[PDB]
Amino acid sequence: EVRTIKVFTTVDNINLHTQVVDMSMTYGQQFGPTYLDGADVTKIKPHNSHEGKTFYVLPNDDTLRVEAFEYYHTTDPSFLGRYMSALNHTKKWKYPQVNGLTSIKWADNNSYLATALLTLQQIELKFNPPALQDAYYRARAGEAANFCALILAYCNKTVGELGDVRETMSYLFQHANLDSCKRVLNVVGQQQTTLKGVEAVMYMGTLSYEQFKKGVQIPATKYLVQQESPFVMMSAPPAQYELKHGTFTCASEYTGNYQCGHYKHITSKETLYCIDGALLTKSSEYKGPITDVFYKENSYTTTIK
Numbered sequence: 453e454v455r456t457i458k459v460f461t462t463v464d465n466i467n468l469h470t471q472v473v474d475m476s477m478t479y480g481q482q483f484g485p486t487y488l489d490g491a492d493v494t495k496i497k498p499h500n501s502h503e504g505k506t507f508y509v510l511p512n513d514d515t516l517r518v519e520a521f522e523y524y525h526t527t528d529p530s531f532l533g534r535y536m537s538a539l540n541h542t543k544k545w546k547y548p549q550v551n552g553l554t555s556i557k558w559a560d561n562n563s564y565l566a567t568a569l570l571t572l573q574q575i576e577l578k579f580n581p582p583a584l585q586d587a588y589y590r591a592r593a594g595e596a597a598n599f600c601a602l603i604l605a606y607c608n609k610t611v612g613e614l615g616d617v618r619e620t621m622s623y624l625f626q627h628a629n630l631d632s633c634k635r636v637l638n639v640v641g642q643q644q645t646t647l648k649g650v651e652a653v654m655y656m657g658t659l660s661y662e663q664f665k666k667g668v669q670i671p672a673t674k675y676l677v678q679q680e681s682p683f684v685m686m687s688a689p690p691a692q693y694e695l696k697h698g699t700f701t702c703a704s705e706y707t708g709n710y711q712c713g714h715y716k717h718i719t720s721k722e723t724l725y726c727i728d729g730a731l732l733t734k735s736s737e738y739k740g741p742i743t744d745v746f747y748k749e750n751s752y753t754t755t756i757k
């Protein structure tokens with residue numbers, strides 16, 4: 453007794469393809485690996501309630517492959533299942549709007565994701581993968597489940613695993629349009645270097661944009677000659693630090709030990725705000741263990757001869 457229902461399949465949720473599914477067989481039997489709003493349905497059999505719904509199915513035909521590459525800018529066959537797997541959790545996360553920004557209530561060690569999401573709403577980033585563009589616009593508004601599930605998928609991270617914020621930005625930065633970004637550095641006889649792309653906007657070793665401009669000791673003195681970017685990201689191993697209102701855009705606080713601690717996010721707005729997931733405190737001065745600081749920028753040229 454052969455019953456059927458109509459569903460849609462997709463790899464990108466923009467191009468829907470209509471499917472008739474035998475209610476007697478499993479989705480996997482008919483589509484291969486198959487997901488519904490994250491939940492893997494590959495060994496379960498169609499339900500009546502399934503009529504009309506969209507189902508994610510790994511690209512098996514060259515059409516789906518093309519649609520898939522064009523949406524994610526990856527060909528990694530495991531990507532879609534990882535995104536769906538991550539998505540099955542992040543959809544249960546809560547995303548409060550703390551301070552006019554979208555955060556994440558703590559869960560499964562997602563403090564790092566929260567801090568990067570907050571940061572990503574405060575700086576000028578144009579994503580090239582449409583998936584990320586679309587996921588980010590929704591996350592700005594308050595629905596950040598997909599952006600977060602994509603971030604894990606691109607960065608090959610499991611739910612529950614604490615990630616490193618600097619490393620994530622780096623990954624994301626490589627999927628964003630930072631081609632126009634330029635950095636000129638001089639070391640001191642005098643040896644000048646030119647950086648571009650993600651290397652133009654990132655530095656490990658000091659938290660202070662002012663120090664970078666004044667002069668940093670190295671194994672000699674390195675100093676910033678020219679910055680052409682919308683922001684710069686100053687990182688360094690965690691260290692006690694005074695954050696002064698108006699002198700930065702935002703910053704990552706890390707308390708704890710290597711690969712087993714906890715991130716908070718500090719934002720300079722009308723005052724210093726500490727966004728700890730769903731929790732929020734306010735202080736005019738802040739001092740704490742900091743490892744990333746962001747500063748907005750347009751164009752900067754040294755005055756050093």
Ligand SMILES: CCN1CCN(c2ccc(C)c(C(=O)NC3(c4ccc5c6c(cccc46)CC5)CC3)c2)C[C@@H]1C
Nearest residue numbers: 614615616617619688689690706709710711712713743
């Ligand atoms: C590809 C190799 N990756 C090495 C780093 N891994 C990782 C994962 C998760 C976290 C929270 C941290 C971390 O804890 N990152 C921070 C950090 C804390 C403490 C110390 C740090 C030092 C250097 C630099 C950062 C530090 C010295 C002491 C907070 C920035 C790192 C990811 C990966 C395996």
